[PDB]
């Protein structure tokens, strides 16, 4: 279950490999809009933190989850800053979320005295004052519990369909990035002149099996003039000598 709005589950993704393109390429989402980044170039980036904000809204509200939009959700529930960078992913969840009679676990904030700040969250049920006497603590004239708590029905228009929304934001907080897209690789072919890239080490030469042994620890070896002599392959931990191409 996804949470309602006025209620955000922020996953906090760190220390992992993000196969972003799986989400993009698997066309199971109705909406997959990326701001500031191509959805397919996201794989070449790495962040200190990635946040996934999980919530449920109605179909005609999907368009409000955007840096430039306004409305009941954009302003009182989940506001994105105008400089938002990240991806908004959403899909039709009618199959899980609609109930006959209405699946009333879904809350929306119909009341606030001001717009909500970007990424601000306010989860109080405080009875709202519309005027006159505060009337605090009870509903009444000029006192309104803030959230409607609508339900979803099996019979609906596409707009009343529940949608599950996950918003991915990305940041670099003056720290080593830890959420990286996957590395790609090629097959390893020996006894040919090849332009190599092993981990972060590059150069052209010919690899052959080596008779060297490294402590479990070392990854690369060098000669007396600091030239890489051999490398350990990252997948098969064998040591391969590098000769110059003639």
């Amino acid at each position, epitope marked *: 279950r996804f949470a309602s709005v006025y209620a955000w589950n922020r996953k906090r993704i760190s220390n992992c490999v993000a196969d972003y393109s799986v989400l993009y390429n698997s066309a199971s989402f109705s909406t997959f809009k990326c701001y500031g980044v191509s959805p397919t170039k996201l794989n070449d980036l790495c962040f200190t933190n990635v946040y996934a904000d999980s919530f449920v809204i109605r179909g*005609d509200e999907v368009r409000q989850i955007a840096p430039g939009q*306004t*409305g*009941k959700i954009a*302003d*009182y529930n989940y506001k994105l800053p105008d400089d938002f960078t990240g991806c908004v992913i959403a899909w039709n969840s009618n199959n899980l979320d609609s109930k006959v009679g209405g699946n009333y676990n879904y809350l929306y904030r*119909l*009341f*606030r*005295k*001001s*717009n909500l700040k970007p990424f601000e969250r306010d989860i109080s049920t405080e009875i*709202y*004052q*519309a*005027g*006159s006497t505060p009337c605090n603590g009870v509903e009444g*004239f*000029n006192c*309104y519990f803030p959230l*409607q708590s*609508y339900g979803f*029905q099996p*019979t*609906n*228009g596409v*707009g*009343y369909q529940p949608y599950r929304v996950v918003v991915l934001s990305f940041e670099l907080l003056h720290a080593p990035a830890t959420v990286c897209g996957p590395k790609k690789s090629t097959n390893l072919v020996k006894n040919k002149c090849v332009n190599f890239n092993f981990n972060g080490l590059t150069g052209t030469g010919v690899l052959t099996e080596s008779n060297k042994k490294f402590l479990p620890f070392q990854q690369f070896g060098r000669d007396i003039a600091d030239t890489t002599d051999a490398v350990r392959d990252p997948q098969t931990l064998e040591i391969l000598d590098i000769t110059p191409c003639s």
Partner: antibody
Amino acid sequence: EVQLVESGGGLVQPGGSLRLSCAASGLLVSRNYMNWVRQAPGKGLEWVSIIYSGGSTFYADSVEGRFTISRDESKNTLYLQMNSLRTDDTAVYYCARDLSDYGGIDCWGQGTLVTVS
Amino acid sequence: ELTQPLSVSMALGQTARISCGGDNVGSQNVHWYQQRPGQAPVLVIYRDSNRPSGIPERFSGSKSGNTATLTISRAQAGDEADYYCQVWDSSTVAFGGGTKLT
């Protein structure tokens, strides 16, 4: 509970503008969604504009280009600045306090007609 | 938008009903107003069926698949008004064209 009253002009010309105003006893303008509702002169009701409680505004594209809705919280006064007037806009303009789903339009004014000719 | 029957007339001592039809589903909350000519619309039915304090007990609402309905338990000459229904659609507040009841 709320005593909401309109104020506005008389005859204005097409292409002109007019500042309309609503205020009420027992109500904070800054805390409500407020609407201006128009009753076409023997034709029927249309929504024209809304100001969100403490927020943004929306307009009926099907009704007008741009007229603006605004509020002054120190006065609890709602305003509609009409512009780009047409004779087509002769109508009764009403004050309205909108509770959306929680309770529809709870409070109405009496209605002020704007004559455009 | 909200469809309308056009009228109810000489409904005296009987019930009276109005229906608004929309792709808008009874799922959209449908509220109702009574506009006596010359007056601002008066909310009569809210959150689909409920009635406000201050109007006759005669009023209540109901709904079908895509249609909201207003019901008056006993019709009187004194109930004449142009009755309306409204929809909160995508921040657009729309109204039906009104039903003439007497």
